[PDB]
Design a binder for this molecule. Structure first.
Ligand code: SF4
Length: 753
């Protein structure tokens, strides 16, 4: 067909829209109905379009992704599992992005220099494993993974998977970009079909157009308050309607990004002229030209069916601020001042933080700068502390050039390295004592307990970058930028005009310094060295194969009450130091989860000793003594981040099964991948029949089968037993992972020995 390369770094890897077209046509012949846009891109990437059973919410699709992207907090364990596979080279375009391990402390260059010193061992391991297996490497300082992907790798119709739950960001350029755990990335780098449960499709019709202070972030802050954090589970969110053309390409990426907070498989927007424009300004006019010739396959079919439709009128949407400890507690900015007051949420804002992958684009920096120049024109500066993270080197170089960074420095902000930083708790915060109740407002996405600064009483609210700037200048939540007055230096009351800024640089982007490192596709005879006494890296020992028996008299390690996020199961911040060391990071296992017995975090009863202690220590004690254990959880267990450490750690410390009312998708897949049994109650009221003291037998593992429930015998202390039924969503591919001990063990059996 055309020979248009997938990116500037892979001149020989061509976009296959011909293949996409061919597969869409095979599938629509079978289904005889309109296809949504997500169905076109997803079913157009099927391994076997002619034979695949396609039922939304029901069948597992065997897909062929176009490329794999990893960031350095998850790439370590994905590459250690790739090293166990024994395979010589990755089968599809793959990149590593070093963005998670740069701690904010001093700002910019100083923080970057220090992270390069502190994290040398890790960055060295990833560059070397990258050179050897043929993975591209974006060096520290290059930018947050999703901003580098939008700028260089996402195009209309791509199917991309990434080891990070905010990989949906790339839906802002018309592709299907899905968050997975490191073991799923290994399947694709290994060349075997990736499986995904066929999604439902929620259509969101946008009407009207944005104006004034309302920005793209408000659309997804409103959708999250509507759907709630579990409302998107099992579905792709597909935006459509006349209002779509009112949003910039990075604005579309913001809305798709935070779809992660409602549990959605991903989100996507149809190819339009704002995307074409962004592709041309990022050096990819030939890809825009080819997508124009294939435009039919890059928009939804007329009259396609959504399983749920939501309609939002962009012209009536007002500025929102969500939180404090869930991203779906939504408030208009005009009322957060009074709800806070009523609820006892601290009103004075300590720190205002703009950035993260959700809101770090050129336009976000221009709109924040536009608020800040108005304050400056009245002789004001931020009352709160104010930090700014540019999403990539190209954006840092261009906002510097076009004057935005200096305005933001002059109102009192500190520009941080192009990295996650305070968003995953990589922040050396010292203005509050630990346990001090305080409020910070961010333009981030999650705001779970102790995620930004490990302080559980920090109240974090997420909003748009221009509203963080306005509230940082006022320093109080009781300020509405739309209505209220600030007092300048000169004694006059003045009002903030709504920010206006260009979506893209008028001139071209300044690319900044060189940060990509191509694999030697010649040499590749690197030895990857992992010191056997390293505290940060450790080669994996394979998990045990299933012994062929039922699981009798399992001890309950903990019965969790309430919300149990992957940040509750395997915290980040200081623990990021150990993301390549399974035994060392297992010391944070479930330390944030609330135990129903006492309502305490990290305090469970050891069954043998009858002493209450830390959860990691109690799991190690049971493991040491041969006691197999179980976790009993509530609804949406595993909400959040895709980090597979939340599944690897319970497997390492002797866990066998996790029985909940429901699971978030990526955690449930990670649990099956590591050879654990994720099971749900056939009747959620049975959660109330199980007490911490009871022992459980899971029965019927011998004829474990797709669609057949498992019998659980609850053994009460008084001799009383009760049988309940537990559902599972395993197909026969996944039952093989369980029988082998893990998915990686199974792949190694298929290597003929
Ligand atoms: S959500 Fe935060 S921690 Fe996760 S990739 Fe984005 S900026 Fe980094």
């Amino acid at each position: 067909r055309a020979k248009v390369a997938m990116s500037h770094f892979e001149p020989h890897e061509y976009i296959r829209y011909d293949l996409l077209e061919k597969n869409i046509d095979i599938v629509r012949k079978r289904l005889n109905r309109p296809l949504t846009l997500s169905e076109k891109i997803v079913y157009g990437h099927l391994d076997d379009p002619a034979n695949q059973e396609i039922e939304r919410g029901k069948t597992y699709l065997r897909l062929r992704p176009d490329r794999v992207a990893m960031q350095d907090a998850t790439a370590q364990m994905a590459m250690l599992q790739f090293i166990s596979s024994g395979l010589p080279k990755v089968a599809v375009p793959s990149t590593i992005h070093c963005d998670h391990l740069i701690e904010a402390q001093l700002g910019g260059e100083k923080d970057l220099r220090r992270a390069k010193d502190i994290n040398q061992e890790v960055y060295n391991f990833l560059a070397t494993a990258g050179a050897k297996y043929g993975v591209g490497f974006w060096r520290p300082g290059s930018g947050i993974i999703h901003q580098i992907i939008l700028e260089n790798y996402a195009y209309p119709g791509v199917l991309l998977i990434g080891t990070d739950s905010h990989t949906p960001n790339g839906g802002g350029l018309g592709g299907i970009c899905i968050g997975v755990g490191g073991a799923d990335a290994v399947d694709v780098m290994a060349g075997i079909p990736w499986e995904l449960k066929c999604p439902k499709v929620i259509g969101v019709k946008l009407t009207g157009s944005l104006s004034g202070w309302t920005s793209p972030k408000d659309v997804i802050l409103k959708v999250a308050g509507i759907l709630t954090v579990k409302g998107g589970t099992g579905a792709i969110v597909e935006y459509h309607g006349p209002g779509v053309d009112s949003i910039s390409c990075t604005g579309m990426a913001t809305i798709c990004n935070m779809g992660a907070e409602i549990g959605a498989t991903t989100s996507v927007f149809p190819y339009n002229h704002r995307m074409k424009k962004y592709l041309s300004k990022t050096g990819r006019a030939d890809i825009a030209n080819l997508a124009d010739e294939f435009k039919d396959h890059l928009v939804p079919d007329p009259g396609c069916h959504y399983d749920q439709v939501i309609e939002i009128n962009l012209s009536e949407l007002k500025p929102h601020i969500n939180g404090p400890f869930t991203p779906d507690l939504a408030h208009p900015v005009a009322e957060v001042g009074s709800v806070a007051e009523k609820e006892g949420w601290p009103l004075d804002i300590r720190v205002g933080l703009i950035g993260s992958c959700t809101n770090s684009s050129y336009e976000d920096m221009g709109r924040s700068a536009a608020v800040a120049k108005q304050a400056l024109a009245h002789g004001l500066k931020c009352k709160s502390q104010f930090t700014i993270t540019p999403g990539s080197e190209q954006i840092r170089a261009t906002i510097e050039r076009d004057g935005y960074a200096q305005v933001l420095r002059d109102v009192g902000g500190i520009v941080l390295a192009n990295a996650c930083g305070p968003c995953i708790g990589q922040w050396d915060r010292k203005d509050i004592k630990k346990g001090e109740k305080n409020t910070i407002v961010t333009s981030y996405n999650r705001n779970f307990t102790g995620r930004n600064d490990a302080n559980p009483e920090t109240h974090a609210f997420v909003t748009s970058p221009e509203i963080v700037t306005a509230l940082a200048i006022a320093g109080t939540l009781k300020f509405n930028p739309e209505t209220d007055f600030l007092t300048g230096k000169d004694g006059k009351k003045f009002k903030l005009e709504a920010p206006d800024a260009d979506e893209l640089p008028r001139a071209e982007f300044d690319p900044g310094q060189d940060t990509y490192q191509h694999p030697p596709k010649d040499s590749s005879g690197q030895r990857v060295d992992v010191s056997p006494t390293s505290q940060r890296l450790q080669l994996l020992e394979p998990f045990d194969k299933w012994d062929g028996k039922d699981l009798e008299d399992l001890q309950i390690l903990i019965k969790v009450k309430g919300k149990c996020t992957t940040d509750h199961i395997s915290a980040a911040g200081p623990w990021l130091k150990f993301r390549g060391h399974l035994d060392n990071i297992s010391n944070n296992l479930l330390i944030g989860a609330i135990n129903i017995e006492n309502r305490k975090a990290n305090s469970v009863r050891n069954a043998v000793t009858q002493e209450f202690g830390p959860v990691p220590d109690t799991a190690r004690y049971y493991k040491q003594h041969g006691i197999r254990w179980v976790v009993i959880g509530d609804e949406n267990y595993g909400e959040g981040s895709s980090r597979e450490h939340s599944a690897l750690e319970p497997r390492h410390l002797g866990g066998r099964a996790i029985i909940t009312k429901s699971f978030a998708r990526i955690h449930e897949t990670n649990l099956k991948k590591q050879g654990l049994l994720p099971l749900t109650f056939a009747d959620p009221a049975d959660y109330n029949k199980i007490h911490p003291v009871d022992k459980l037998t899971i029965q019927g593992l011998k004829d474990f089968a797709p669609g057949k429930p498992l019998k659980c015998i609850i053994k009460h202390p008084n001799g009383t037993q009760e049988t309940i039924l537990l559902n599972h969503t395993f197909n026969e591919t996944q039952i093989e992972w369980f029988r082998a001990g893990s998915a990686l063990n199974r792949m190694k059996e298929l290597q003929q020995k």
